[PDB]
Amino acid sequence: KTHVQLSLPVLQVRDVLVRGFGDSVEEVLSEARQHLKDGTCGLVEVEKGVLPQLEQPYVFIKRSDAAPHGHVMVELVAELEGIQYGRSGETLGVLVPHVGEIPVAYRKVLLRK
Numbered sequence: 770k771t772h773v774q775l776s777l778p779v780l781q782v783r784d785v786l787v788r789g790f791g792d793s794v795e796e797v798l799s800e801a802r803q804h805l806k807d808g809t810c811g812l813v814e815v816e817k818g819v820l821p822q823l824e825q826p827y828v829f830i831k832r833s834d835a836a837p838h839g840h841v842m843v844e845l846v847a848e849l850e851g852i853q854y855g856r857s858g859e860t861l862g863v864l865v866p867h868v869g870e871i872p873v874a875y876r877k878v879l880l881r882k
């Protein structure tokens with residue numbers, strides 16, 4: 770399937786234990802996709818003060834369209850030193866590894882595998 774329905778745990782930035790997916794744009798997009806497949810991916814909502822508390826390169830989910838079965842359609846865009854790899858819509862947040870942090874909410878998304 771070109772798209773997969775996922776329910777991502779929304780984590781508070783200060784709870785996150787592993788604050789990024791790796792060291793290159795290609796590695797972070799790779800690892801983010803693997804963690805989304807394995808159900809070990811969390812989401813941090815981007816507000817003032819959040820990104821400096823996380824590790825670059827960043828992986829964003831961005832809205833790819835205007836929402837089947839409650840699931841917003843999204844795609845991945847990485848960012849490193851202010852350059853973005855991918856072009857998409859509004860940020861829904863920044864992806865991080867999930868290693869058992871308690872969420873505050875769940876965000877239903879339809880991910881373009």
Ligand SMILES: OCc1ccc(CO)c(Br)c1
Pocket residue numbers: 773775801802803805806807880881882
């Ligand atoms: O089942 C969730 C899932 C499965 C495969 C891929 C491949 O990219 C992704 Br992303 C997410």
